[PDB]
Each structure stands twice: as structure tokens, then as C-alpha cells.
Coordinates of N, CA and C in Angstrom, one line a residue:
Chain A
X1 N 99.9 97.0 155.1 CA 100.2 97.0 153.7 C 101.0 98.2 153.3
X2 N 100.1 99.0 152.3 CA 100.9 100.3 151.9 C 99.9 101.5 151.6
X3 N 100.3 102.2 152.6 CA 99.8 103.5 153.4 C 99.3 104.4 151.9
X4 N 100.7 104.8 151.4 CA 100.7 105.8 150.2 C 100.6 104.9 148.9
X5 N 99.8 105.1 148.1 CA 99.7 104.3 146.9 C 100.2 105.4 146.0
X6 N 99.8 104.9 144.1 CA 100.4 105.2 143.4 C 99.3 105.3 142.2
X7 N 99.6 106.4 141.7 CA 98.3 106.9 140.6 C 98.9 106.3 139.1
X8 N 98.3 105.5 138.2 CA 98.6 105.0 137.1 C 97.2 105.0 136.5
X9 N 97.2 106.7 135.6 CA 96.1 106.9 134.9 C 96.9 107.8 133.7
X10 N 96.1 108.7 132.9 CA 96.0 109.5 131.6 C 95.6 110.9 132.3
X11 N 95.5 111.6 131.2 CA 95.4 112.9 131.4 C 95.9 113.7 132.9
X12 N 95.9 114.7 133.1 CA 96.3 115.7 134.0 C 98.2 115.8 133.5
X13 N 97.9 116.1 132.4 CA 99.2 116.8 131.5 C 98.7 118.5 131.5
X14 N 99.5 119.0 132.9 CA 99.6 120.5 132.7 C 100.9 120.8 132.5
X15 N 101.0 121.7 131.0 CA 102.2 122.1 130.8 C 103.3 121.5 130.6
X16 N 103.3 120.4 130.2 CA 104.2 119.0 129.6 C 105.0 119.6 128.3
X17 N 106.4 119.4 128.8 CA 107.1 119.8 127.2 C 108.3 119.3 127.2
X18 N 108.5 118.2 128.2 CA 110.3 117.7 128.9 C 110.2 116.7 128.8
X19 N 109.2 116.0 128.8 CA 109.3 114.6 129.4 C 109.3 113.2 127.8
X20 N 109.2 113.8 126.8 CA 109.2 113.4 125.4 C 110.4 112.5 125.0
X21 N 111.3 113.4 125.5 CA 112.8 112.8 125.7 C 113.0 111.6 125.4
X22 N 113.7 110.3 124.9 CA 114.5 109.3 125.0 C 115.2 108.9 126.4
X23 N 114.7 107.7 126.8 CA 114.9 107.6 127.9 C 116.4 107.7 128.3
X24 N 117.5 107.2 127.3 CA 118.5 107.1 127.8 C 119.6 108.7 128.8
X25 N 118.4 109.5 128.2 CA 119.2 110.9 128.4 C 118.2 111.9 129.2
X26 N 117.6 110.9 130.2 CA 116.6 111.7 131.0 C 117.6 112.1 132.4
X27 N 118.1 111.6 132.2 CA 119.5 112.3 133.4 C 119.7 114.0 133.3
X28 N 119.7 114.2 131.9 CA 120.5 115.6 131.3 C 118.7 116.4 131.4
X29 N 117.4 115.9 131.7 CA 116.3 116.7 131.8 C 115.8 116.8 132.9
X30 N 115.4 118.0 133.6 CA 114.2 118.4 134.8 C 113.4 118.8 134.3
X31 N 112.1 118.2 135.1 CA 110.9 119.0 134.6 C 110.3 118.4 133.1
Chain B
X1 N 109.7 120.1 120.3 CA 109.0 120.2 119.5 C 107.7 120.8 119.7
X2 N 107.5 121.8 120.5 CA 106.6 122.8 120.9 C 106.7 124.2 120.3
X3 N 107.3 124.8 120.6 CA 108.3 126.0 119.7 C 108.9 125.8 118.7
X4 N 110.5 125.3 118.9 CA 111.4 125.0 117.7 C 110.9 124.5 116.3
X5 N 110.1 123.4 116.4 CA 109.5 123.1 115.5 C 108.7 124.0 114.7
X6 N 108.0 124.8 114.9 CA 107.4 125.9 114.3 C 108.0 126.6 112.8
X7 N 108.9 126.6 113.9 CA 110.1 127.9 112.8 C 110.1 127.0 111.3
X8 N 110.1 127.9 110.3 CA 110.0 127.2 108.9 C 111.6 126.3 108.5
X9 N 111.4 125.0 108.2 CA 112.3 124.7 107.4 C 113.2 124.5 108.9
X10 N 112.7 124.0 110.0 CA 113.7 123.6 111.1 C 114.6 122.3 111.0
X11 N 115.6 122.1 111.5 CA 116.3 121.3 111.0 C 116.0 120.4 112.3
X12 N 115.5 120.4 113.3 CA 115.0 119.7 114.5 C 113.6 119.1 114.0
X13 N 113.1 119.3 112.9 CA 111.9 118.4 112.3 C 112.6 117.9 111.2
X14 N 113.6 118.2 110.7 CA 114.3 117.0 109.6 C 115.1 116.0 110.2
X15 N 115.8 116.3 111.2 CA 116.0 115.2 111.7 C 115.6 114.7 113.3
X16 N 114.1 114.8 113.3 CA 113.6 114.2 114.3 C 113.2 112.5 114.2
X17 N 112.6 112.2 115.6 CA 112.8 110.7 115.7 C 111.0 110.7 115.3
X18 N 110.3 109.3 115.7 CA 109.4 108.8 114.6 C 108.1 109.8 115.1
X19 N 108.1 110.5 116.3 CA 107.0 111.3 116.8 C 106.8 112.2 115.5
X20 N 107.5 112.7 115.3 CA 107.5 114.2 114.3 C 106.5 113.5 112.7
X21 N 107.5 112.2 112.2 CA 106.8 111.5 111.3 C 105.5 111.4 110.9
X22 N 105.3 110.7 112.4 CA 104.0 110.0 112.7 C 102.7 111.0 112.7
X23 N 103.3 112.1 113.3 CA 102.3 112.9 113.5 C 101.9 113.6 112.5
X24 N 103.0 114.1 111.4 CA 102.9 114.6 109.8 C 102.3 113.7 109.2
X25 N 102.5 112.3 109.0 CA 101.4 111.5 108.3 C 100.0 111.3 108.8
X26 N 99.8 111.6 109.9 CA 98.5 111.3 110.8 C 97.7 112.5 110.4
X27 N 98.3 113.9 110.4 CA 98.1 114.9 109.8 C 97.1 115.0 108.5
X28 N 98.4 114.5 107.3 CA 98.3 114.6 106.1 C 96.8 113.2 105.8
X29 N 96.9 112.0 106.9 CA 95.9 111.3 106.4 C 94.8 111.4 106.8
X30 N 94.7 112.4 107.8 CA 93.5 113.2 107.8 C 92.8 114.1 107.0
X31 N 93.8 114.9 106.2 CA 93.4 115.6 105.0 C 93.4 114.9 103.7
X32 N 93.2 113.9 103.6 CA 93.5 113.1 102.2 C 91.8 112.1 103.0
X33 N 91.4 111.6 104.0 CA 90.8 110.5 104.4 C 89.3 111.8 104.2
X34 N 89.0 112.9 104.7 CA 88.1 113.4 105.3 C 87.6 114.0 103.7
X35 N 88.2 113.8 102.2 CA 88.3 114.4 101.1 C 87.6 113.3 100.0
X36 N 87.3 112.1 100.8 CA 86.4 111.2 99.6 C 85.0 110.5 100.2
X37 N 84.7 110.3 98.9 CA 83.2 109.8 99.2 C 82.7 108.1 99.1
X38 N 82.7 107.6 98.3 CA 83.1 106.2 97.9 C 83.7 105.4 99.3
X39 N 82.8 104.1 99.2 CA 83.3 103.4 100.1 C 83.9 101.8 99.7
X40 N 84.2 101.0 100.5 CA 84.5 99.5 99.9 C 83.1 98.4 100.0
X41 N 82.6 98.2 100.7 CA 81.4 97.6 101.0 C 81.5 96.3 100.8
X42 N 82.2 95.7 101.1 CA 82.5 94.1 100.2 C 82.0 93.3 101.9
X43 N 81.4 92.2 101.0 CA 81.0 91.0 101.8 C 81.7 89.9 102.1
X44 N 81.6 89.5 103.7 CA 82.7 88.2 104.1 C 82.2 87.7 105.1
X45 N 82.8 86.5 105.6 CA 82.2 85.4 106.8 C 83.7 85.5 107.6
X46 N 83.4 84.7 108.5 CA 84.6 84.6 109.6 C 85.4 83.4 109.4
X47 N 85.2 82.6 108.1 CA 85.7 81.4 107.9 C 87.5 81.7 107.7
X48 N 88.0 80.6 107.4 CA 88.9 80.9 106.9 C 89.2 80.8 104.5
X49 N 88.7 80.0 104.4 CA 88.8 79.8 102.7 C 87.6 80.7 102.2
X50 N 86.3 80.8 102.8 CA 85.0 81.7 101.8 C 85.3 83.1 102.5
X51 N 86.2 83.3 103.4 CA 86.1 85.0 103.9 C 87.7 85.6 102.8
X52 N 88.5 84.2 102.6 CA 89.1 85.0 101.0 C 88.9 85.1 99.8
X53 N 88.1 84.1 99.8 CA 87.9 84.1 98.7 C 86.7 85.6 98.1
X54 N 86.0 85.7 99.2 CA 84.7 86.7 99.0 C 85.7 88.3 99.3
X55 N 86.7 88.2 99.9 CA 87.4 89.5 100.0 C 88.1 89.3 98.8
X56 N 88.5 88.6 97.9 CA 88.9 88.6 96.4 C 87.9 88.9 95.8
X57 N 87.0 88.5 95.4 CA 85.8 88.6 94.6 C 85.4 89.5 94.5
X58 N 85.4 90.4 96.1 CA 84.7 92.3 96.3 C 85.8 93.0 95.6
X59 N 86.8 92.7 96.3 CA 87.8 93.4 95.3 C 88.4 93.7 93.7
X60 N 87.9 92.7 93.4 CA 88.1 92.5 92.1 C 87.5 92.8 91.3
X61 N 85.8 93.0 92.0 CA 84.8 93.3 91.5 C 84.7 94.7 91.4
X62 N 84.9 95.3 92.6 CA 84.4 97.0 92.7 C 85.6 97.6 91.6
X63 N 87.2 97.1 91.7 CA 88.3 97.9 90.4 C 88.4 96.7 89.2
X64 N 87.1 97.3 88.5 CA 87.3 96.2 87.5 C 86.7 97.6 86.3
X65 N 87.8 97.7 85.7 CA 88.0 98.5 84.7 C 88.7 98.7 83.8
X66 N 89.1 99.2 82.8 CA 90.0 99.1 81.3 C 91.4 100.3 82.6
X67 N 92.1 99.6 83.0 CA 93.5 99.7 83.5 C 92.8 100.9 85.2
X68 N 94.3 101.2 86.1 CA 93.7 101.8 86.8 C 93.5 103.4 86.8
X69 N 92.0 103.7 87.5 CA 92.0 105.0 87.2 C 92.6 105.7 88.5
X70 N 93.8 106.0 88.2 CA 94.4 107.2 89.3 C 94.1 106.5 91.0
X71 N 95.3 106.9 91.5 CA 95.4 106.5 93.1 C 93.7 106.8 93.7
X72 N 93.3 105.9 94.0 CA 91.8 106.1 94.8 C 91.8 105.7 96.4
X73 N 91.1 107.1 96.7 CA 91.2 106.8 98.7 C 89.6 107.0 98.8
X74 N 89.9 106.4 100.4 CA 88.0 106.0 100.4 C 88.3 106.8 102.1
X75 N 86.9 107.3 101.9 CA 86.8 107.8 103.4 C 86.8 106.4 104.8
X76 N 85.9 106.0 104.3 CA 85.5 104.5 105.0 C 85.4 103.6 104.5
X77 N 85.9 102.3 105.4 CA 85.3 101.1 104.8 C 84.5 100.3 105.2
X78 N 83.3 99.6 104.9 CA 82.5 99.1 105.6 C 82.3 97.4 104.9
X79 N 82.3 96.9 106.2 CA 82.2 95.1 105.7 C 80.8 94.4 106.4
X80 N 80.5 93.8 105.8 CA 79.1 93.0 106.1 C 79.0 91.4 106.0
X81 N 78.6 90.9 107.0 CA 78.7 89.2 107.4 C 77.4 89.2 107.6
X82 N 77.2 87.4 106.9 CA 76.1 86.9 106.8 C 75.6 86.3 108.3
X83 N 74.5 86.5 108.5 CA 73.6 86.2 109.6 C 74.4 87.2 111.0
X84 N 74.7 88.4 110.9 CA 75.6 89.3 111.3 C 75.4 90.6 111.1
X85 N 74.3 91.5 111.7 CA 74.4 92.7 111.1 C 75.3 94.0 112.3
X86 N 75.9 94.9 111.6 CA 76.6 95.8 111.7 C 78.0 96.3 111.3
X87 N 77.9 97.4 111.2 CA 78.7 98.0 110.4 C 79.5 98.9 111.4
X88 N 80.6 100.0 111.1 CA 81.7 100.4 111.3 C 82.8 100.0 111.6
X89 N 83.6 101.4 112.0 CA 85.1 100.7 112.4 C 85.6 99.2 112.9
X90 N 84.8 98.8 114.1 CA 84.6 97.3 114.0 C 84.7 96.5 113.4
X91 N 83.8 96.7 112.2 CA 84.0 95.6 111.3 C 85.7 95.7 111.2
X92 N 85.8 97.1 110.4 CA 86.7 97.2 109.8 C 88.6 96.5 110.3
X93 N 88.6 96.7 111.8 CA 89.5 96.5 112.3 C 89.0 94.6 112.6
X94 N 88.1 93.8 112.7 CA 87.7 93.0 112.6 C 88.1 92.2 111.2
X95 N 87.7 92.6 110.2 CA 88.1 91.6 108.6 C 89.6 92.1 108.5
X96 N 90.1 93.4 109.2 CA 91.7 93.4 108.7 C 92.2 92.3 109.8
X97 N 91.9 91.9 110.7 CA 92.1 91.1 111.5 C 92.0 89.7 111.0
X98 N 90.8 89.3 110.5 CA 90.7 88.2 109.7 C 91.1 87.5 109.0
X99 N 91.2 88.9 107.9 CA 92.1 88.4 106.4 C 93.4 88.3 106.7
X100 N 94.2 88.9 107.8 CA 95.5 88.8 107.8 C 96.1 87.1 108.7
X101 N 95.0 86.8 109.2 CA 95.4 85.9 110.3 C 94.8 84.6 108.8
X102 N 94.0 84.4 107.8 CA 93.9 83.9 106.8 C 95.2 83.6 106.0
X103 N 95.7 84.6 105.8 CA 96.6 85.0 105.0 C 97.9 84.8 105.3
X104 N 98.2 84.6 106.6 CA 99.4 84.5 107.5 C 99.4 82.8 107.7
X105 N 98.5 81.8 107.5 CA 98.8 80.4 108.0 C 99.7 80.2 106.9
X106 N 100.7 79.2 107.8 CA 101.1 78.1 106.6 C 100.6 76.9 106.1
X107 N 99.8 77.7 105.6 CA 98.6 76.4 104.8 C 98.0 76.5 103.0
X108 N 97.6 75.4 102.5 CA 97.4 75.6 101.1 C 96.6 76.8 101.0
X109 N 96.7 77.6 100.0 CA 95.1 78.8 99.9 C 93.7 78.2 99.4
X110 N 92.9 78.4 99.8 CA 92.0 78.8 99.0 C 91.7 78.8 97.8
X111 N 90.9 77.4 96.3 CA 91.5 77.1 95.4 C 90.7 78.3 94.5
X112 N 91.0 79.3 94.6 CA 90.4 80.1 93.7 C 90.6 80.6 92.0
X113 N 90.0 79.2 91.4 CA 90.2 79.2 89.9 C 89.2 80.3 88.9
X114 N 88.2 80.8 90.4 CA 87.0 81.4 89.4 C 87.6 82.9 88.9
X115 N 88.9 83.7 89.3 CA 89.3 84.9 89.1 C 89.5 85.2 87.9
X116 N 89.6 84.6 87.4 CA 89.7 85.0 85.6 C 89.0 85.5 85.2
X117 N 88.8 86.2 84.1 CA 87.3 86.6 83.0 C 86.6 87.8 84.2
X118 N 101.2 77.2 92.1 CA 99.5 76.7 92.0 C 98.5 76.9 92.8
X119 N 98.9 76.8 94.0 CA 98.1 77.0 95.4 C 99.1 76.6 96.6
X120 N 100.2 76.7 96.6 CA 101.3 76.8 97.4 C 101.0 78.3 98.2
X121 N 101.5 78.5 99.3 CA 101.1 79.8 100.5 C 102.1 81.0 99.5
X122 N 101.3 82.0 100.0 CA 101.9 83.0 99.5 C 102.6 83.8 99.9
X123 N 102.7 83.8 101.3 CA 103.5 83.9 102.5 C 104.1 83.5 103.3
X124 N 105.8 83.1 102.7 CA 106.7 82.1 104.2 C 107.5 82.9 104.8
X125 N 108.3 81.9 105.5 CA 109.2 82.5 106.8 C 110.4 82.2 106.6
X126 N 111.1 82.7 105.5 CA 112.7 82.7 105.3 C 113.5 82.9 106.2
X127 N 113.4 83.8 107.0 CA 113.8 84.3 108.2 C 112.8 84.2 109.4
X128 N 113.2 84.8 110.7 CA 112.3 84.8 111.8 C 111.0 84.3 111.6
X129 N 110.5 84.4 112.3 CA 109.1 84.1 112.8 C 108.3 85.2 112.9
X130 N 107.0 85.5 111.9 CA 105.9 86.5 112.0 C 106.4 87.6 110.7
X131 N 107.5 87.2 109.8 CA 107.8 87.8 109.0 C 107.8 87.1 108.0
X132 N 107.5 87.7 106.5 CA 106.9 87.3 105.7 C 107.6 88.1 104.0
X133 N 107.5 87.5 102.8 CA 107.7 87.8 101.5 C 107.3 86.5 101.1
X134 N 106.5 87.4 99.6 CA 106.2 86.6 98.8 C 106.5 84.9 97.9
X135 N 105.8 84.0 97.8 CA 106.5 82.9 97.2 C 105.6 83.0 96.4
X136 N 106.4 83.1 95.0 CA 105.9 83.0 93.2 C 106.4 81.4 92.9
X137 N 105.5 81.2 92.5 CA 106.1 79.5 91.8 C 106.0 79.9 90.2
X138 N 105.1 79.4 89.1 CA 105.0 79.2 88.1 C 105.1 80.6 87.3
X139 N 104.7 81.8 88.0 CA 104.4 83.1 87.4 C 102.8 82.6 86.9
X140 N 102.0 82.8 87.1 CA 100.5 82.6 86.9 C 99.9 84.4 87.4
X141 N 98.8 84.5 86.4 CA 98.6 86.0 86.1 C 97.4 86.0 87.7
X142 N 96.8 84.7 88.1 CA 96.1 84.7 89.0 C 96.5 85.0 90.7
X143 N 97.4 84.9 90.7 CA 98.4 84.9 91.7 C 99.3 86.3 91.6
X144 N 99.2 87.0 90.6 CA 99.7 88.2 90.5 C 98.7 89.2 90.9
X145 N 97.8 88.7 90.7 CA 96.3 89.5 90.5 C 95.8 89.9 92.6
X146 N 96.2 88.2 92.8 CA 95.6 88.1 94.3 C 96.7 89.1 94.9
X147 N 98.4 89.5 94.7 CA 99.2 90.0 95.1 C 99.1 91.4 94.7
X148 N 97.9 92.1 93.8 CA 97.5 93.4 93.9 C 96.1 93.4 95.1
X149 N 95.7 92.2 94.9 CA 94.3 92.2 96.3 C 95.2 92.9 97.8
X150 N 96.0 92.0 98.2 CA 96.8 92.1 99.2 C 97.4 93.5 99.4
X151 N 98.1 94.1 98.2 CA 98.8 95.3 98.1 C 97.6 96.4 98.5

């Protein structure tokens, strides 16, 4: 099957301040 | 909107997108909701014709006075069904559920002649589907009355 899975939960927002963005312009953000 | 926003009179919160809004009204209706005492309390069933007609009746009943007194906000609303007991947000999110899915058929209303002292829907679909404005036929004061219930 598959070895490495994939976390799809909430919380563990440390230090989040980028990611708010509009998706069209997530190219022009890191981080 | 972590920092920049801060600053007084920023122009990155005048013209922000609906986060900034949402959260200023979410804000503000917290300090306007946590500021009254008075509640609605009105009684209803799960039917479809006696759960409007009884959410007309509470309503009409609790603002029944010589014109209206000043914008009134309620902390909570609480609803109560027969053979049914409990109360809170549940309900709440429950009869707004109710009344609207009531309210939304395209079907005759509910003949409610007792509001005093034709019955064509009140709500069609001019356009798309799940969108709605008013249909006035005759101008009748009872049907103006039910369209402040709604409001």
C-alpha cells in the first residue's frame, strides 16, 4: 500500500501568518 | 493582518477581503449579543403549517405594542416543542432550520386568517434555483405583517 501517510487534522498552527493568502498568488508566498 | 492591521486607520483593513469583515462583525456581535437579557421563548412543532403558523403567533405576540420600541437584541433564543423537552442552541439552529425549509416550498401557506386584532407562496424563483424575493398579490396588511415576521 502506502508506507508514508498524510495528516488531515486542526490545530498545531505554530506561528502561522502566510498562509491566509488567496490562493491564486501562493506562488509569490514561503512560509 | 497580524501587525499592519493594528496601525490606526490602516488602509489594508479598508480594503481587505471578507476575513477582516467577518471578524469585525463577529467582534461587534459579540458585544451587542453578551449586552441583553430578554429572550424569544416562542412555541413550535416540526410540522410543516402549525410550526408557522405558531412561529407567527409567538411573534406577534411577544412585539405587540403601540408602534416599535427601538431596535431590540436578545441574548438567546430559546424554542420549545410539544411532547419534546429541551432547550438551547439546538433548538435554535433546529426551528431556524425548520422555518426556513417551511418557508422555502413552493406550496400554498398556511391559511392564517387569525392575525388580525391571498395565500399564494411568498417566496419564488424568478431566477435560479434556491433564490428567492417576495410575491405581493393584493397588498393585504396580513401578508405585510407575516413579511415583518420573516424580516
Amino acid at each position: 500500500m502506502l508506507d508514508e501517510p498524510l495528516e488531515r487534522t486542526t490545530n498545531s498552527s505554530h506561528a502561522n501568518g502566510a498562509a491566509q493568502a488567496p490562493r491564486s498568488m501562493q506562488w509569490a508566498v514561503r512560509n | 493582518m497580524e501587525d499592519v492591521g493594528a496601525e490606526p486607520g490602516s488602509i489594508l483593513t479598508e480594503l481587505g477581503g471578507f476575513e477582516v469583515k467577518e471578524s469585525k462583525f463577529r467582534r461587534e456581535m459579540e458585544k451587542l449579543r453578551n449586552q441583553q437579557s430578554r429572550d424569544l421563548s416562542l412555541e413550535v412543532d416540526r410540522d410543516r403549517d402549525l410550526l408557522i403558523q405558531q412561529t407567527m403567533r409567538q411573534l406577534n405576540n411577544h412585539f405587540g405594542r403601540r408602534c416599535a420600541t427601538t431596535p431590540m437584541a436578545v441574548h438567546r433564543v430559546k424554542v420549545t416543542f410539544k411532547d419534546e423537552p429541551g432547550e438551547g442552541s439546538g433548538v435554535a439552529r433546529s426551528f431556524y432550520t425548520a422555518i426556513a425549509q417551511a418557508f422555502l416550498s413552493n406550496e400554498k401557506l398556511p391559511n392564517l386568517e387569525c392575525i388580525q386584532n391571498d395565500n399564494a407562496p411568498l417566496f419564488y424563483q424568478p431566477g435560479k434555483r434556491g433564490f428567492y424575493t417576495p410575491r405581493p398579490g393584493k397588498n393585504t396588511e396580513a401578508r405585510l405583517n407575516c413579511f415583518r415576521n420573516i424580516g
